[PDB]
Every structure is written in structure tokens, then in C-alpha cells.
């Protein structure tokens, strides 16, 4: 499986290993249990527009 097809299903960073892909995330996010999604750890994570007025 490859990062060149749908970014390996990763929400953010994708890197290829021998047979598999490994996803990761920017600071202020935690990689989800599914190994793909990036979950913000706070209300103003990097790179997100501030649309949900708190």
C-alpha cells in the first residue's frame, strides 16, 4: 500500500514502509486508534480555520 494513492488514507502525513504505510500528525493532534485520522488535542489546532465560534 502506498502514499501515492489517497495519501495512504492518512489525514495528514504519510510515509511508506516495506509493505505498509504509517500515518502521523502535526503537533497539536493525536493519531486516532484507526491509525489514519488526526484528532485535535485543543480548540485551536494548527492549520484549522476558526469557524466553530466558541
Amino acid at each position: 500500500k502506498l502514499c501515492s494513492l489517497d495519501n495512504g488514507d492518512c489525514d495528514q502525513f504519510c510515509h511508506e514502509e516495506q509493505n505498509s504505510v504509517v500515518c502521523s500528525c502535526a503537533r497539536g493532534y493525536t493519531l486516532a486508534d484507526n491509525g489514519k485520522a488526526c484528532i485535535p488535542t485543543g480548540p485551536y489546532p494548527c492549520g484549522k480555520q476558526t469557524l466553530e465560534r466558541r
Binding site: 502514499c3 501515492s4 495519501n7 489525514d11 495528514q12 502525513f13 504519510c14 510515509h15 502521523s24 502535526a26 503537533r27 497539536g28 488526526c38 480548540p43 485551536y44 489546532p45 494548527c46 492549520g47 484549522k48 480555520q49 476558526t50 469557524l51 465560534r53 466558541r54
Partner: protein, 233 residues
Amino acid sequence: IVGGQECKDGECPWQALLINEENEGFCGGTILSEFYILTAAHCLYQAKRFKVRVGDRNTEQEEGGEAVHEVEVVIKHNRFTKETYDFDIAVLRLKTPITFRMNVAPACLPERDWAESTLMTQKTGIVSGFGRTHEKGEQSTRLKMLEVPYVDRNSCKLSSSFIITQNMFCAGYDTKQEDACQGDSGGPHVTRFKDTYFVTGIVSWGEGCARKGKYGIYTKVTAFLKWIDRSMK
């Protein structure tokens, strides 16, 4: 910004504005964290002293969410060259931390290899700022943004009267009248990937603004991701 559109509320929250001895904007920056702003080294020579404003969309209206921060430390790239604007990058550490809120949030720093394979290979990025709305015009009082195509390096070099180093990249349009301009320099070039915006460039220079046969020239942030990390400690 020549052409483009006004930024909508919440849509450019990483924009910073460097303000000179007057509270007049002269350059942009990008919020990286509560303490750090990314800007262009050439901006450091364009005002004797300056401060950083965040949270502003309209420089003629006191919305309520704006804040001004003093600069504690300027970290200029030690290879910045005024003649060519090679290594056109600096980080500012603020004296007091930014409080993230509506219209005030950092842009993400990407991992280098993935940025090269995935961000720089997108069709477009986004540039924003309060700079001039045409080459010989006045600065915008409202924050603007603009989608700019990535332009291939060979075309970039052929078009330019000045050297395009591997610390630079072109973006924009050959003849379509849309570009960044004076007063935008130092500001963000970001690339969207699944609704997250990553820092990909710093507005650096151009030969005029939106001229036919000329592109916008940006500092290639991928070349400096390690440098940025070290500068931020």
C-alpha cells in the same frame, strides 16, 4: 493582494501583520505558535522598529479581537542576502504569548518529505495579506487572500530578471492579473490538504505585481523546516 477576495471571518487566522512606527502595516507574517511568527528576513530592514498584530481583518475597525505583541528576539537566517533575497526567512519570538481565539490560530508546519511529495505537488496554494491591490496602488484595509498556482521552476527561471535559487519558488499567473504585492511580503503561503492548512512559503519578492510574464517569488519553506524547528527551540 491584487485580485483574489476578502478573507472571510475565521478563514485566515494565521495572518500576522508587522506594524512600523505608526501602527501602519508594512509586511506580513505567519503565526507558528503562541510565541513564534514566521516572516521574511528582508522585512527586518524595512522599518527601524516594529510590533506584530494578530486577529485583525479590517485595519480601520476595532472589532474587539485584535492584539498587538512586542518582539523579544529576531532570528534572521545567517545566509540572508539583500542583493538576491536568497535565504529570505526569519522567526520572531514575541515578548508575550498569543491567546488563540477567533481569527487567531497557527498554521501547521509539515514534515519535509511529505510536504515535497504532497503539498508542493498540489495545483495551488493560498497567499494572503494587507498589501497593495494593484502595483501602484494603496494597501488594502481589509485582509485579502488569493489562490495561486504553483509554477514550475524552469518557467520560473526563464521569466525572471534575477536569479531564482533553490530556496525560492514561483507561484501565480503568467498574464492573469492576480498576485501578491508590496505590503504582503513576509506573509503566508499555505497549502490545503484535507481541510488543514500547512505553511509552504513566505511571500518574498516580485518584479512589479501581477505583471505579464512575471510570477510571485516565495521562500521555499521546505528547505528551512529544520532551521525553523531549531529557531523555535
